[PDB]
Design a protein around this ligand. Structure first.
Ligand SMILES: CN(c1c(NCCCCN)n(Cc2ccc(Br)cc2)c(=O)[nH]c1=O)S(=O)(=O)c1ccccc1
Ligand SMILES: CN(c1c(NCCCCN)n(Cc2ccc(Br)cc2)c(=O)[nH]c1=O)S(=O)(=O)c1ccccc1
Ligand SMILES: CN(c1c(NCCCCN)n(Cc2ccc(Br)cc2)c(=O)[nH]c1=O)S(=O)(=O)c1ccccc1
Ligand SMILES: CN(c1c(NCCCCN)n(Cc2ccc(Br)cc2)c(=O)[nH]c1=O)S(=O)(=O)c1ccccc1
Ligand SMILES: [Br-]
Ligand SMILES: [Cl-]
Ligand SMILES: [Cl-]
Ligand SMILES: [Cl-]
Ligand SMILES: [Cl-]
Ligand SMILES: [Cl-]
Ligand SMILES: [Cl-]
Ligand SMILES: [Cl-]
Ligand SMILES: [Cl-]
Ligand SMILES: [Cl-]
Ligand SMILES: [Cl-]
Ligand SMILES: [Cl-]
Ligand SMILES: [Cl-]
Ligand SMILES: [Cl-]
Ligand SMILES: [Cl-]
Lengths: 279, 289, 285, 279
């Protein structure tokens, strides 16, 4: 079994065009076939996520909630989430990451099916210095990770989507804090790399990986999603749809979810899914 | 005679669900939507403001804005139990208005342009009657619509007409004398079952006490009430601010330029925020004409 | 061998006055002419021999921009569509150009983006017989050729711009054909000489492959002021995020090995140019 | 009373949303009441402007064309345009410039009515180092101009709209190339400043002055104009409209222009001008 964690650090309640930002990472985990999900946020925001999503049983999900008292690093998700993870495999997604593209279901599926080691994704960006950066040898094997380097060794940033085996809790517990006293995800990923158990999969230029964490980037992500949805008459990262297509809820349950929203474009969309075949 | 302000940040029901943080708490680029109508009232020289919203949203506005004393304002809060029309602001706000002149602004309206201070100033200085603004739009049937005679005098108002008599919509910014509370009290619900601001404005028109000022095409009046319109407004503000290195509708700036807060107060506001905090600090050091 | 045709048809006065200055398919989508997108699409399919068909007025302007294409390892030719009497007319105008070869037709104002696009074109291109088209879920199918599917997902009807669409699956402006298409086009009667009638002829012989182009691909129309602006913002967002260009023909020629490092360096020097130089030094997976 | 020059150093043929870029500076000169306009461009581009605009008699204009053989600086417009200007006052519209705002007609009118000296506009920008920069004293009087300073003395850039008396040709003739080896408009403006004949008017933050000279800025200008026009049902910088409202063309001339465009939003708009009162 693989359990999911969304870290919504100290924003993920803001809309990207037509739905809350958190619908995107939630939909990402759901596409990977993960239905048991811990949402970690600030003391102030955790209750607001609870109020919005509840226990998730309406979407065939099992949602739980935990607080990050202070932003002491992303790897703190594994300590906060230790009892939630138990003895299971896990996946970690960041709250302000948006993914789009063809074969994304297959790309997540393959990473998810690995019973041992860790899987991350490398994506060519203009500004790699803002992220974890992967260095490759001539043969395309990952040989180094650097967190926000002044002099990036490549243009390949590690995305905010991480797949882990049962070692991650123990690796997180044994992490030496950074000079700033923070538990860094890059140190978790380097631990797997040093054991020869880090799979770095290329996320090709044919995929969109967008940040939604600045005023400018949120606006650009909004326009991007609006253009796709208005062209297609299909929604990106509609959790009700992904639950339906995963068979976690049936036609009758989707109809019940649509009814209260029926006066607006979202409820009308959910109803139309019942009457058309989408390939 | 003092003029008090009302922002009606009404419920949109389930219209913007599931995206809706309430509508007027959503950002237009870099600041909450409510900063725009708040900045509008402040530019008109209004410091005493009632914010009317849903029971669920009222606490979130209070948490964001507080009593407004940090910005030289006196902010109060009231609830609209149900969205039974915009003219209900004058009943909810009756004791707040008391014997004073008033201004009403809608929560999802954005204004921009040169002479906007002068345009508000002139409307605000009228001690009697009411002032509204007429703006040429593509879809007037969505608004209150003004009909003009050959001489350019307003002769009719219609709320959301099937057959608009012009392309001039009344904007969500209204200036009133002490008659508005009494006019609002006598209003009966419209065919749509609402207490309509257009009925308030028609009452002033019939007494020959409605000033309809043209808001020229050189001004931007933007609606932020749909997913699409909010996105367009965001890009519009982003383009202006990134070009100018100046912010549109930064309340701290307007308070400072009105001399409602001094350099020392602005510095105290800037420190905890130190792009927004950096912007507030630059206001202290730069001459902007 | 498979030869390519780009039909950059007249839009009449539809986009005037913006298109009084520059033809529709010469208008930029963010950072490059519209025609770079369909050209790059044919190049990604491995097609090097391409006929560009346009109006009498616009054909010379395409020639002035692109020349014979030898700079990009291409063989570009030009022909005129006297009047916009239908898309199937490309096969009559292009008859002697096509000769005895397989063909592909792309429309001038169609933009494609997505992962596996090289593989999707590759598979369609490798079919030596019949025709291949792509079906894409759209909001407004009534604007396009519309595919009807049976319960088993087999294509059973095509209708051009139906009042009552039988699905939300539009046929995209990208078509792969065997040696039958010229003969089918010759026998077509006006409805315009419609590409949907060509595709239905292949369907009736059981030789039409309708591949689903999934929602994970972007198929954008650039034929209105609004749609061109949206396409511009879409490409700008991808390119500024990635530090990579969409549909840069020099890059696709280089990665296809149609031009070498020395040829790319010669193209970069007079110039976009900084981007071409970076291609020489960086491994992009 | 005043002749116009558009220096188009091609960029100015590209559309800003729904019309060629050059419609914007042309509409600007027309709003100032200028009907006699010289378009200066490269040998290659001058014919393309001629093909688009012709002699301008359709819009009640008198359009002429001249070539800049080599890009030796924007002040060369006054040498190339010397015989065109003759003994008249002039206005120059330079760069890839878009203007919008309330009182713009009045702002141009006032600058235009000055019978002596020169008038320029100063606008607060984020990146003044890209432009001519105005320094002000404590009393707000202009005291220095610098072309693209490394250390700008203010955030006030001089816009690409210049009003000149009959001295400009003689000042241009006496100019020597700058360190960058160009005849610079800033040197023309400084000559007027030194003789106490430069009026620097503030263009307030309530006006939009947009650059359309990069891929990014052209896209942003497109979205800006699209937002205004689709909101208002009114067009920005439609030359036919400005000619009609200036009474340079009559209803019969406007009808002839509108009919061939009538199946699109532009011709429908020109027809609406015949029947509708817009204040
Ligand atoms: C745009 N995509 C997207 C979808 N396509 C995936 C195509 C299936 C493989 N042929 N499906 C269909 C879908 C089909 C089967 C199943 Br089981 C689940 C979902 C949706 O329901 N919602 C989507 O939003 S996505 O890029 O993969 C994605 C998804 C989620 C967040 C972010 C991005
Ligand atoms: C963009 N404008 C705008 C400003 N300009 C006003 C023009 C100067 C008068 N000559 N000032 C300066 C300003 C100067 C003096 C005083 Br007292 C108050 C404010 C700001 O501080 N913030 C602004 O945001 S605005 O269109 O009028 C507007 C304003 C508010 C909401 C919406 C729209
Ligand atoms: C965005 N893509 C895109 C690319 N990706 C394709 C990735 C295949 C990797 N296995 N390549 C790389 C590329 C790699 C190998 C070869 Br041989 C040719 C080109 C480019 O050079 N330019 C591109 O622009 S695209 O969607 O396929 C496309 C392409 C053309 C027009 C429109 C859209
Ligand atoms: C948006 N404006 C704009 C207009 N407003 C001016 C309002 C004056 C009210 N007293 N008029 C009306 C107009 C009215 C009377 C006469 Br005579 C000429 C033109 C237009 O016809 N076209 C416009 O496009 S503008 O900012 O000045 C401008 C103008 C040009 C380029 C860029 C920007
Ligand atoms: Br990492
Ligand atoms: Cl986050
Ligand atoms: Cl790819
Ligand atoms: Cl289905
Ligand atoms: Cl009204
Ligand atoms: Cl105006
Ligand atoms: Cl045509
Ligand atoms: Cl086309
Ligand atoms: Cl569509
Ligand atoms: Cl078809
Ligand atoms: Cl897909
Ligand atoms: Cl200057
Ligand atoms: Cl101003
Ligand atoms: Cl550029
Ligand atoms: Cl149009």
């Amino acid at each position: 079994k693989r359990k999911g964690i969304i870290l919504a650090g100290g924003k993920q309640l803001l809309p990207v065009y037509d739905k809350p930002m958190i619908y995107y990472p939630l939909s990402t985990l759901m596409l990977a076939g993960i239905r048991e999900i811990l949402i970690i946020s600030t003391p102030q925001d955790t209750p607001r996520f609870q109020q919005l999503l509840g226990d998730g049983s309406n979407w065939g999900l099992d949602l739980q909630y935990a607080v990050q008292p202070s932003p002491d690093g992303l790897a703190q998700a594994f300590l906060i989430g230790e009892s939630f993870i138990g003895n299971d495999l896990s996946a970690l997604v960041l709250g302000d990451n948006l993914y789009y593209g063809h074969d994304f279901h297959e790309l997540l599926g393959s990473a998810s099916q690995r019973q041992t080691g860790a899987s991350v994704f490398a994506y060519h960006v203009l500004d790699p210095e803002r992220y974890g950066v992967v260095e490759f040898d001539q043969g395309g094997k990952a040989i180094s990770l650097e967190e926000k380097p002044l002099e990036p060794k490549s243009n390949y940033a590690v995305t905010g989507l991480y797949f882990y085996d049962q070692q991650v809790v123990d690796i997180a517990r044994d992490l030496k804090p950074s000079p700033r006293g923070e538990l860094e995800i890059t140190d978790v990923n380097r631990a797997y790399l040093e054991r020869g158990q880090l799979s770095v999969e290329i996320m090709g230029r044919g995929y969109a990986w967008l940040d939604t964490g600045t005023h400018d980037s949120l606006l650009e992500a909004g326009q991007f999603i609006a253009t796709l949805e208005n062209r297609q008459g299909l929604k990106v990262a509609c959790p009700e749809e992904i639950a339906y297509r995963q068979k976690w809820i049936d036609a009758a349950q989707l109809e019940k979810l649509a009814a209260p929203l029926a006066k607006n474009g979202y409820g009308q969309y959910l109803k139309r899914l019942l009457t058309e075949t989408v390939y």
